[PDB]
Amino acid sequence: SGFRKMAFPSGKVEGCMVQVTCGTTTLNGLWLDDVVYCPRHVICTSEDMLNPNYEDLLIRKSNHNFLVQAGNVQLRVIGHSMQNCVLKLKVDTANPKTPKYKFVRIQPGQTFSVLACYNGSPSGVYQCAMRPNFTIKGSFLNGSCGSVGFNIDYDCVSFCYMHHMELPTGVHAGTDLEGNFYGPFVDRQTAQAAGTDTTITVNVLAWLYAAVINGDRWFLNRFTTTLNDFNLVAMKYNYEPLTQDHVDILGPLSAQTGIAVLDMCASLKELLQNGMNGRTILGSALLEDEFTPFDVVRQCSGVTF
Amino acid sequence: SGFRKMAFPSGKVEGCMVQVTCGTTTLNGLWLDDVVYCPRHVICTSEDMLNPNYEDLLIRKSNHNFLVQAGNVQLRVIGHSMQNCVLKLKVDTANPKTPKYKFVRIQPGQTFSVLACYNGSPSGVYQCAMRPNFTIKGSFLNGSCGSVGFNIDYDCVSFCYMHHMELPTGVHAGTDLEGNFYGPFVDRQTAQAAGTDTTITVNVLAWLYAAVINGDRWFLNRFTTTLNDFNLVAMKYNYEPLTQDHVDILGPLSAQTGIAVLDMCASLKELLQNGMNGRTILGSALLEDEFTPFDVVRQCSGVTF
Ligand SMILES: O=C(Cc1ccc(F)cc1)Nc1cncc2ccccc12
Ligand SMILES: O=C(Cc1ccc(F)cc1)Nc1cncc2ccccc12
């Protein structure tokens, strides 16, 4: 019993974190095989960030301008190149701790664990979701750039996020490990803002199934709804549309609890229109949307890595 | 910016998790140096659990009755002893991955990370707090016994909890790493129940200071309170008494934000009286009590917004 915001075990990623220093800027790098990946803005001064020409800034740097420290050992940079918003520093030593890995680009609504790092040293691990507005509500301070997001499926770490910046509302923006930003953001000190966010409907439904599995049923009702009527209500409350794909993905949870997906949708509609009436669900007074259907099944079944 | 329920990176603990088997029972063990620590109830059958005589059950065992598996390698047990409710299995191999560590017994209100494991394999990591009634609201399924709670301030792992059982309300009971249970619980299947749980007042205050540091002040008021009047009100909402020790511990946060501890107590009193009126504090519609003053200082910026 119990239901917690659970992150993947971070050990496989901790063994990849390094410190990358270029001039006065120090941030984190991810060392996989003989390459260290880090945000390309490590080469910028605060002045350069106003309007940077990364190719022009990079051509002025030699391999020795990049100081890479893995624990208490300095790695020697033997090559450097840029791929989108990520700098790839070729080093002479392959990371002996390199896990089985892949670079995967995730979609809004998908969750992942973030290993927050400072000076190449892991500080904490937390679970978060890629918001529909492509930001993450992370917890990062100065020096956290280059910290990564990941999932684990079997024994393979799927790296999906690299931290680049904090937006004025305190939310965070970054890229996949190929340097493509999530969302309409750029790596430049210029006016940028997160768009209006919405709630990840399929995830709220998954969390309602988790509450039922954990013995919280007060919100269940005898009613059902159509996908179109539910989607009209979801649009009204700034909830993402629920698709037939989402309904299909919730199938196993629906079969285990005996509550049809559209039956859980009628429960959600009632919660949206009436609130919780002083009650909580899994210790929350808000509808939680940062657990996917897969996260719920994994946590309620004890999958290991 | 941002404020998340953040766990310590689990890598140092993942490298210590092993599987312990005694007959038909399999659970987790913590392998540090040449000793594997695990719940003593691994030697019990479900029948033995009403009134087990652990001394009598253990005397019938030899070293070869304990099967310890570290990854895909069987460790050889060369000695066994019981210390309170933990079994210590001496093995013929020191764990090469043993981190710098200590065994620390924590007090209610203290937080820690839990690395949930099944069959000696880590499944997830989450943040927990030792409740005032000495239980933890974990997320644990059958097979999770032997999973541990820890803190990693610096490069030293302070092990503070070992999971032993789930109580009828779905909450969890365990011991420190010397085998002493937290709370009035026993490793017996006799009827046992958690005492009435209360809110960890000092932690709610710490979290209100975290909200002020991150830029939110809507909940502040022009009032102060005496410590005794605060406690008289707070006890009516099932909040733990706030002691002068708690007021002293909140000193640094009070100095950083400029809000006196008793001035924050007045805000808390008003929040208990009024509720949030549709507002949230750090993304929560409830008053959060699983962040300590130390957690807030570690996570938050040293510069208030
Ligand atoms: O945002 C930047 C620097 C930066 C990057 C790209 C860019 F376009 C402009 C500035 N770093 C930070 C990242 N995360 C949390 C932070 C908290 C506080 C301060 C800085 C943080
Ligand atoms: O509680 C026990 C076994 C046990 C130990 C000591 C004792 F005296 C009685 C029973 N195991 C479990 C631990 N945690 C979560 C669990 C969820 C579901 C089922 C079993 C769980």
XYZ file of C-alpha atoms and ligand atoms in Angstrom:
652
model
C 0.000 0.000 0.000
C 0.865 3.674 -0.365
C 1.457 5.885 -3.376
C 4.391 8.211 -3.671
C 5.870 10.442 -6.340
C 8.586 7.974 -7.140
C 11.665 8.541 -9.245
C 13.757 5.826 -10.934
C 16.896 4.722 -9.014
C 19.527 7.296 -10.145
C 22.763 5.278 -9.749
C 23.205 4.540 -13.477
C 23.018 8.303 -14.205
C 25.118 9.409 -11.193
C 28.077 7.498 -12.685
C 27.814 9.737 -15.811
C 27.758 13.204 -14.185
C 30.788 15.411 -14.724
C 31.635 19.111 -14.255
C 32.279 21.183 -17.394
C 34.068 24.496 -17.017
C 34.607 27.012 -19.787
C 36.095 30.286 -18.631
C 34.103 31.600 -15.687
C 31.055 29.327 -16.327
C 30.833 25.956 -14.647
C 27.896 23.578 -15.312
C 27.162 19.813 -15.561
C 27.970 17.386 -18.328
C 26.784 13.857 -19.107
C 29.698 11.519 -19.900
C 28.664 8.519 -21.987
C 31.338 6.444 -23.783
C 34.030 9.022 -24.897
C 31.683 12.038 -25.205
C 30.584 14.644 -22.626
C 27.265 16.302 -23.493
C 26.428 19.694 -22.024
C 24.391 22.878 -22.873
C 26.100 24.900 -25.626
C 25.606 28.088 -23.544
C 28.612 27.003 -21.366
C 30.745 28.942 -23.957
C 28.888 32.261 -23.389
C 29.567 35.326 -21.185
C 26.406 37.099 -19.802
C 26.956 39.671 -22.633
C 27.155 36.906 -25.306
C 23.884 35.417 -24.039
C 22.063 38.592 -25.198
C 22.551 37.521 -28.849
C 24.968 34.601 -29.233
C 26.510 33.241 -32.427
C 27.510 29.879 -31.029
C 29.512 28.801 -34.113
C 31.576 32.053 -33.907
C 32.020 31.673 -30.135
C 32.965 27.978 -30.494
C 35.571 28.452 -33.263
C 37.547 30.669 -30.824
C 37.753 27.794 -28.275
C 40.347 25.049 -28.318
C 39.965 21.620 -26.651
C 42.029 22.789 -23.603
C 39.577 25.695 -22.953
C 37.081 23.000 -21.771
C 37.933 21.666 -18.315
C 36.050 18.432 -17.617
C 36.250 16.947 -14.152
C 34.876 13.462 -13.371
C 34.991 13.173 -9.567
C 38.553 14.151 -8.635
C 39.981 13.297 -12.085
C 40.449 15.712 -14.979
C 39.448 14.300 -18.375
C 41.285 15.630 -21.444
C 39.083 17.029 -24.200
C 40.342 15.847 -27.636
C 37.518 17.224 -29.811
C 34.444 19.441 -29.706
C 31.367 19.869 -31.852
C 27.858 21.248 -31.579
C 24.611 19.418 -32.295
C 21.652 21.802 -32.075
C 21.792 23.325 -28.507
C 24.127 20.686 -27.084
C 27.952 20.771 -27.090
C 29.655 17.373 -27.475
C 33.142 17.207 -26.005
C 35.120 14.201 -27.162
C 37.355 12.995 -24.321
C 40.298 10.522 -24.397
C 38.683 8.169 -21.848
C 35.484 6.180 -22.325
C 33.340 6.274 -19.166
C 33.769 2.828 -17.604
C 30.471 3.421 -15.783
C 28.506 4.016 -19.049
C 25.184 2.187 -18.684
C 23.119 0.685 -21.539
C 21.449 3.872 -22.858
C 19.404 5.577 -25.537
C 18.504 9.158 -26.321
C 14.727 9.499 -26.533
C 12.588 12.548 -27.118
C 9.467 12.482 -24.954
C 5.995 13.966 -25.508
C 4.097 16.347 -23.167
C 2.423 14.345 -20.396
C 5.273 11.832 -20.204
C 7.085 11.748 -16.859
C 10.775 11.302 -16.055
C 13.238 11.505 -13.188
C 15.583 14.445 -12.882
C 18.948 14.071 -11.199
C 19.680 17.652 -10.124
C 23.464 18.294 -10.092
C 25.803 21.125 -9.142
C 29.510 21.115 -10.034
C 29.165 17.634 -11.557
C 27.872 16.257 -8.256
C 24.350 14.842 -7.897
C 22.331 16.629 -5.242
C 18.862 15.125 -5.523
C 16.425 13.155 -7.575
C 12.829 14.003 -8.256
C 10.049 12.960 -10.582
C 8.329 15.417 -12.934
C 6.274 15.577 -16.125
C 6.848 17.367 -19.392
C 3.983 19.893 -19.185
C 1.606 20.353 -22.189
C 3.295 23.843 -22.528
C 6.703 22.036 -22.844
C 8.114 23.365 -19.564
C 8.926 21.307 -16.470
C 8.091 22.474 -12.968
C 11.551 21.531 -11.748
C 13.564 22.540 -8.728
C 16.805 24.076 -9.934
C 19.223 26.740 -8.743
C 22.167 28.442 -10.518
C 24.723 25.794 -11.522
C 22.036 23.178 -12.302
C 22.378 23.499 -16.121
C 23.347 20.216 -17.718
C 21.382 18.153 -15.119
C 19.450 15.400 -16.941
C 16.045 13.732 -17.048
C 15.639 10.046 -17.721
C 13.536 6.907 -17.513
C 14.619 3.280 -17.191
C 12.966 0.463 -19.177
C 14.484 -2.917 -18.252
C 18.276 -2.210 -17.919
C 18.428 0.687 -20.444
C 18.534 4.319 -19.332
C 16.555 6.496 -21.755
C 17.910 10.043 -21.429
C 15.159 12.477 -22.402
C 16.021 15.890 -20.959
C 18.979 18.166 -20.347
C 18.434 21.320 -18.268
C 19.235 24.650 -19.988
C 17.277 27.510 -18.355
C 14.712 28.911 -15.964
C 11.839 31.022 -17.297
C 10.551 34.165 -15.429
C 7.680 32.227 -13.793
C 10.185 29.875 -12.101
C 9.501 26.941 -14.473
C 12.218 25.257 -16.553
C 13.179 24.740 -20.162
C 15.580 22.304 -21.733
C 16.344 20.033 -24.629
C 16.409 16.378 -25.536
C 19.986 14.880 -25.635
C 20.228 15.712 -29.356
C 19.962 19.439 -28.356
C 16.431 20.078 -29.628
C 14.480 22.244 -27.181
C 11.158 21.086 -25.843
C 8.804 23.970 -26.563
C 9.229 27.273 -28.360
C 12.283 28.316 -26.384
C 15.735 29.459 -27.421
C 19.036 29.507 -25.513
C 19.394 33.255 -25.372
C 18.905 35.857 -22.641
C 15.801 37.424 -24.251
C 12.108 37.867 -23.329
C 10.602 34.349 -23.177
C 7.569 33.017 -21.354
C 5.795 29.734 -20.882
C 2.452 29.548 -22.600
C -0.741 28.832 -20.641
C -0.536 25.307 -19.318
C -3.225 22.649 -19.165
C -3.792 19.571 -16.987
C -2.720 16.167 -18.295
C -6.105 14.411 -18.292
C -4.903 10.839 -18.957
C -2.489 11.170 -16.024
C -5.220 12.455 -13.645
C -7.332 9.422 -14.647
C -4.326 7.088 -14.037
C -3.905 8.668 -10.558
C -7.633 8.205 -9.822
C -7.153 4.485 -10.673
C -4.116 4.485 -8.315
C -6.338 5.980 -5.566
C -8.960 3.220 -6.159
C -6.245 0.504 -6.040
C -5.110 2.100 -2.713
C -8.633 2.017 -1.253
C -9.806 5.623 -1.940
C -13.289 5.262 -3.654
C -15.381 8.176 -2.348
C -15.273 9.916 -5.756
C -16.697 6.966 -7.695
C -20.257 7.277 -8.940
C -22.798 5.203 -10.878
C -22.494 7.400 -13.987
C -20.736 7.135 -17.297
C -20.087 9.671 -20.106
C -19.317 9.749 -23.820
C -15.756 10.721 -24.958
C -17.234 13.841 -26.698
C -19.202 15.049 -23.622
C -16.164 14.426 -21.416
C -13.954 16.346 -23.911
C -16.359 19.325 -23.855
C -15.985 19.429 -20.033
C -12.178 18.943 -20.251
C -11.924 21.944 -22.629
C -13.891 24.082 -20.149
C -11.516 23.297 -17.228
C -8.219 23.651 -19.166
C -7.696 19.894 -19.267
C -5.999 18.299 -22.269
C -8.332 16.414 -24.641
C -8.671 12.699 -23.879
C -8.165 10.598 -27.006
C -9.135 6.991 -27.819
C -5.382 6.233 -27.447
C -5.576 7.443 -23.816
C -8.711 5.328 -23.242
C -6.891 2.259 -24.689
C -3.771 2.892 -22.532
C -6.013 3.012 -19.409
C -7.536 -0.416 -20.340
C -5.454 -2.542 -17.937
C -6.211 -0.234 -14.964
C -9.897 -0.237 -15.927
C -9.903 -4.079 -15.995
C -8.095 -4.373 -12.621
C -10.406 -1.981 -10.730
C -13.649 -2.744 -12.619
C -14.196 0.945 -13.377
C -14.592 1.654 -17.118
C -12.457 4.596 -18.425
C -15.572 6.640 -19.280
C -16.974 5.700 -15.808
C -13.771 7.232 -14.279
C -14.280 10.229 -16.650
C -17.751 10.843 -15.097
C -16.043 10.800 -11.640
C -13.474 13.362 -12.945
C -16.255 15.561 -14.432
C -17.991 15.619 -11.057
C -14.722 16.528 -9.281
C -14.108 19.331 -11.785
C -17.627 20.772 -11.391
C -18.001 20.296 -7.613
C -14.497 20.099 -6.150
C -13.398 17.651 -3.443
C -15.819 18.996 -0.745
C -13.111 19.049 1.923
C -11.886 15.571 1.026
C -8.504 14.419 -0.312
C -7.424 11.692 -2.757
C -4.117 9.969 -1.966
C -3.255 12.813 0.451
C -3.891 15.542 -2.122
C -6.569 18.283 -2.315
C -5.663 18.847 -6.022
C -6.033 16.449 -8.928
C -2.513 15.137 -9.523
C -1.387 14.893 -13.179
C 2.278 13.857 -12.933
C 1.756 10.037 -12.849
C 1.268 8.309 -16.205
C -0.775 5.101 -16.605
C 2.554 3.226 -16.898
C 3.870 4.842 -13.665
C 0.719 3.716 -11.812
C 1.011 0.123 -13.078
C 4.758 0.053 -12.327
C 4.338 1.377 -8.761
C 1.375 -0.857 -8.002
C 3.305 -3.973 -9.313
C 6.897 -3.425 -8.043
C 8.923 -3.400 -11.317
C 12.726 -3.390 -10.579
C 15.887 -2.153 -12.412
C 13.213 28.347 -8.356
C 10.688 25.576 -7.813
C 10.226 23.307 -4.816
C 9.970 19.581 -5.153
C 9.807 16.623 -2.803
C 13.401 15.727 -3.487
C 15.122 12.467 -2.621
C 18.886 11.928 -2.325
C 20.539 10.290 -5.361
C 20.213 6.544 -4.614
C 23.339 5.135 -6.346
C 25.356 4.739 -3.129
C 22.527 2.622 -1.647
C 21.687 0.699 -4.860
C 25.214 -0.779 -4.764
C 24.398 -2.251 -1.301
C 21.087 -3.990 -2.076
C 21.084 -7.778 -2.015
C 18.433 -10.514 -1.907
C 18.220 -12.659 1.257
C 16.416 -15.994 1.222
C 15.648 -18.312 4.135
C 13.562 -21.280 3.047
C 10.504 -20.007 1.189
C 10.917 -16.349 2.321
C 12.783 -13.880 0.145
C 13.392 -10.197 1.103
C 16.078 -7.478 0.784
C 19.346 -7.103 2.625
C 21.785 -4.212 2.957
C 25.382 -5.322 2.306
C 27.950 -3.030 3.893
C 31.580 -4.222 4.255
C 31.292 -8.019 5.039
C 27.842 -7.879 6.732
C 24.331 -8.178 5.241
C 21.641 -6.589 7.423
C 18.040 -7.708 7.009
C 14.765 -8.015 9.028
C 14.973 -10.968 11.404
C 11.472 -12.092 10.286
C 13.134 -13.603 7.167
C 13.553 -16.795 9.333
C 9.768 -16.979 10.032
C 6.943 -18.701 8.240
C 3.554 -16.798 8.104
C 2.453 -19.233 10.913
C 5.526 -18.354 13.055
C 4.441 -14.685 12.900
C 1.768 -14.542 15.697
C 4.223 -15.234 18.577
C 7.627 -16.039 17.025
C 10.457 -16.940 19.340
C 13.247 -15.591 17.198
C 16.001 -16.995 19.440
C 14.500 -20.487 19.081
C 13.948 -20.147 15.313
C 17.503 -18.795 14.741
C 19.333 -21.442 16.813
C 17.943 -24.049 14.346
C 19.633 -22.305 11.388
C 23.106 -22.737 10.047
C 25.038 -20.271 7.808
C 24.168 -22.318 4.687
C 20.399 -21.958 5.354
C 20.818 -18.221 4.356
C 21.051 -17.643 0.608
C 22.382 -14.158 -0.220
C 22.439 -13.024 -3.827
C 24.227 -9.817 -4.906
C 23.271 -9.252 -8.541
C 23.945 -12.579 -10.264
C 26.502 -13.714 -7.649
C 25.812 -15.833 -4.577
C 27.619 -14.621 -1.448
C 28.675 -17.204 1.149
C 27.345 -16.668 4.688
C 30.118 -17.375 7.249
C 28.346 -16.136 10.406
C 24.990 -14.938 11.703
C 23.774 -13.034 14.705
C 20.690 -11.162 15.794
C 20.773 -7.633 17.125
C 17.297 -6.596 18.273
C 14.998 -7.072 15.166
C 17.773 -7.245 12.592
C 19.696 -10.250 11.478
C 23.371 -9.652 10.612
C 24.798 -12.160 8.158
C 28.574 -12.150 7.966
C 29.646 -12.917 4.391
C 33.034 -13.961 2.900
C 33.234 -10.902 0.593
C 33.364 -7.224 1.574
C 31.090 -5.135 -0.665
C 33.463 -3.289 -3.011
C 30.713 -0.715 -3.535
C 30.397 0.083 0.232
C 30.049 3.853 0.546
C 31.161 5.992 3.521
C 28.277 5.305 5.938
C 26.823 5.597 9.437
C 23.797 4.205 11.240
C 21.674 7.002 12.676
C 18.409 6.727 14.616
C 16.091 9.580 13.633
C 13.310 11.414 15.521
C 9.681 11.977 14.345
C 9.502 14.804 11.828
C 12.861 13.863 10.269
C 12.792 13.111 6.549
C 14.703 10.537 4.530
C 14.832 8.918 1.109
C 13.566 5.381 0.696
C 14.975 3.122 -1.994
C 12.125 0.619 -2.456
C 13.503 -2.822 -3.503
C 12.128 -6.237 -4.467
C 14.319 -9.343 -4.770
C 17.413 -7.283 -4.008
C 16.683 -4.992 -6.982
C 15.863 -1.278 -6.617
C 12.503 -0.248 -7.992
C 12.176 3.417 -7.046
C 13.206 6.220 -4.778
C 10.972 8.546 -2.840
C 11.095 10.985 0.020
C 9.448 10.073 3.377
C 9.148 11.527 6.880
C 9.038 9.666 10.189
C 5.501 10.530 11.343
C 4.895 11.711 14.950
C 3.193 8.301 15.529
C 6.493 6.617 14.412
C 5.034 5.174 11.193
C 6.042 6.175 7.653
C 3.544 6.670 4.807
C 5.584 4.674 2.332
C 4.781 2.937 -0.924
C 5.645 -0.687 -0.388
C 4.298 -4.000 -1.660
C 4.969 -7.597 -0.519
C 8.699 -8.353 -0.913
C 9.765 -4.787 0.007
C 10.965 -5.791 3.524
C 14.592 -4.902 4.030
C 14.345 -1.756 1.784
C 16.114 1.135 3.544
C 15.706 4.809 4.359
C 18.701 7.109 4.275
C 20.103 10.612 4.014
C 23.317 11.554 2.139
C 24.487 14.911 3.514
C 28.037 15.128 1.931
C 29.382 11.763 0.478
C 28.307 9.841 3.638
C 25.179 7.689 3.707
C 23.324 7.850 7.034
C 21.081 4.764 7.093
C 18.109 5.481 9.373
C 15.377 3.019 8.484
C 14.892 -0.596 7.448
C 11.409 -1.646 6.322
C 9.776 -4.481 8.300
C 5.983 -4.327 7.897
C 2.769 -2.748 6.749
C 0.175 -1.887 9.419
C -3.617 -2.360 8.798
C -4.113 1.309 7.807
C -1.610 0.941 4.921
C 1.206 2.785 6.740
C 4.624 1.289 7.462
C 6.703 0.310 10.452
C 10.382 -0.473 10.654
C 13.568 -0.200 12.629
C 16.810 1.727 12.726
C 19.854 -0.269 11.396
C 20.566 -1.533 14.941
C 17.157 -3.341 14.809
C 15.281 -1.091 17.260
C 11.762 -0.380 16.030
C 10.531 3.157 15.687
C 7.353 3.353 17.746
C 5.558 0.809 19.894
C 5.594 -1.865 17.203
C 6.748 -5.445 17.234
C 7.657 -7.853 14.419
C 4.634 -10.017 15.301
C 1.297 -10.499 13.463
C -0.605 -9.623 16.713
C -3.135 -6.757 16.514
C -1.190 -3.482 16.409
C -2.335 -0.040 15.362
C -0.721 3.288 14.690
C -1.526 6.022 17.196
C -3.489 9.095 16.012
C -1.315 10.872 13.504
C -0.556 14.548 13.848
C 0.891 17.209 11.536
C 4.596 18.065 11.937
C 4.245 21.733 12.812
C 7.937 22.705 12.567
C 8.035 21.225 9.034
C 4.895 23.127 7.931
C 6.568 26.343 9.194
C 9.801 25.446 7.306
C 7.709 24.922 4.128
C 5.953 28.303 4.633
C 9.447 29.884 4.825
C 10.305 27.937 1.554
C 7.225 29.591 -0.042
C 8.320 33.054 1.099
C 11.892 32.414 -0.217
C 10.443 31.387 -3.564
C 8.358 34.656 -3.750
C 4.953 33.962 -2.212
C 3.618 35.967 0.694
C -0.189 35.932 0.280
C -0.653 33.985 3.548
C 1.270 36.383 5.773
C -0.649 38.620 8.193
C 0.046 41.630 10.454
C -0.171 39.522 13.616
C 2.180 37.652 15.907
C 1.436 35.086 18.654
C 2.899 33.800 21.859
C 4.324 30.285 21.615
C 1.757 29.007 24.133
C -1.256 30.564 22.342
C -0.018 29.076 19.045
C 0.184 25.608 20.627
C -3.310 25.920 22.129
C -4.727 26.665 18.663
C -2.509 24.217 16.722
C -3.347 21.277 19.002
C -7.033 21.792 18.002
C -6.128 20.957 14.374
C -4.075 17.875 15.401
C -0.755 19.670 14.952
C 2.245 18.633 17.035
C 3.292 21.075 19.775
C 5.947 23.557 18.673
C 8.805 23.658 21.167
C 11.480 26.290 21.837
C 13.886 23.859 20.062
C 11.714 24.148 16.924
C 11.637 27.970 17.231
C 15.467 27.990 17.544
C 15.884 25.623 14.529
C 13.734 27.996 12.422
C 16.069 30.942 13.294
C 18.157 30.883 10.075
C 15.020 30.809 7.862
C 13.505 33.625 9.966
C 16.705 35.702 9.464
C 16.825 35.064 5.697
C 13.178 36.064 5.058
C 12.826 38.716 7.793
C 9.699 36.994 9.192
C 9.930 36.204 12.923
C 9.076 32.573 13.874
C 6.051 33.640 15.955
C 4.988 35.937 13.074
C 5.033 32.823 10.778
C 3.112 30.951 13.543
C 0.386 33.617 13.334
C 0.200 33.013 9.546
C -0.118 29.266 10.164
C -2.917 29.867 12.717
C -4.794 31.951 10.153
C -4.257 29.299 7.429
C -5.745 26.633 9.735
C -8.721 28.906 10.392
C -9.386 30.051 6.811
C -8.067 27.345 4.544
C -6.418 28.486 1.285
C -9.473 30.123 -0.375
C -8.712 28.532 -3.756
C -5.024 29.451 -3.571
C -1.991 27.164 -3.432
C 1.369 27.417 -1.701
C 4.262 25.913 -3.679
C 1.823 23.974 -5.872
C -0.073 22.476 -2.941
C -3.641 23.014 -1.693
C -2.705 21.345 1.673
C -0.134 22.398 4.268
C 2.904 20.223 3.559
C 4.723 18.722 6.559
C 7.351 16.418 5.002
C 10.094 19.097 4.485
C 12.259 19.897 7.461
C 14.007 23.190 8.189
C 17.267 21.521 7.017
C 15.607 20.267 3.757
C 14.315 23.776 2.989
C 17.746 25.346 3.502
C 19.408 22.619 1.345
C 16.898 22.964 -1.519
C 16.013 26.691 -1.543
C 18.145 29.565 -2.739
C 20.094 31.470 -0.071
C 18.655 34.673 -1.659
C 14.932 35.372 -1.011
C 12.656 36.466 -3.910
O 18.589 30.193 -16.786
C 19.771 29.999 -16.500
C 20.901 30.634 -17.286
C 20.497 30.983 -18.699
C 20.398 29.997 -19.672
C 19.929 30.289 -20.941
C 19.567 31.581 -21.215
F 18.971 31.847 -22.404
C 19.702 32.599 -20.309
C 20.165 32.287 -19.042
N 20.177 29.227 -15.469
C 19.383 28.603 -14.486
C 18.773 27.358 -14.648
N 17.915 26.802 -13.782
C 17.642 27.472 -12.674
C 18.184 28.742 -12.357
C 17.846 29.459 -11.181
C 18.375 30.696 -10.946
C 19.260 31.271 -11.849
C 19.613 30.615 -12.993
C 19.086 29.329 -13.289
O 4.080 -6.649 6.473
C 4.677 -7.475 5.782
C 5.103 -8.824 6.323
C 5.073 -8.882 7.833
C 6.199 -8.560 8.576
C 6.180 -8.598 9.959
C 5.018 -8.973 10.579
F 5.013 -9.090 11.932
C 3.878 -9.298 9.891
C 3.916 -9.251 8.508
N 5.010 -7.267 4.493
C 4.810 -6.098 3.744
C 5.594 -4.953 3.879
N 5.347 -3.781 3.277
C 4.283 -3.709 2.488
C 3.397 -4.788 2.243
C 2.260 -4.684 1.402
C 1.438 -5.758 1.208
C 1.705 -6.974 1.827
C 2.791 -7.115 2.644
C 3.670 -6.026 2.886
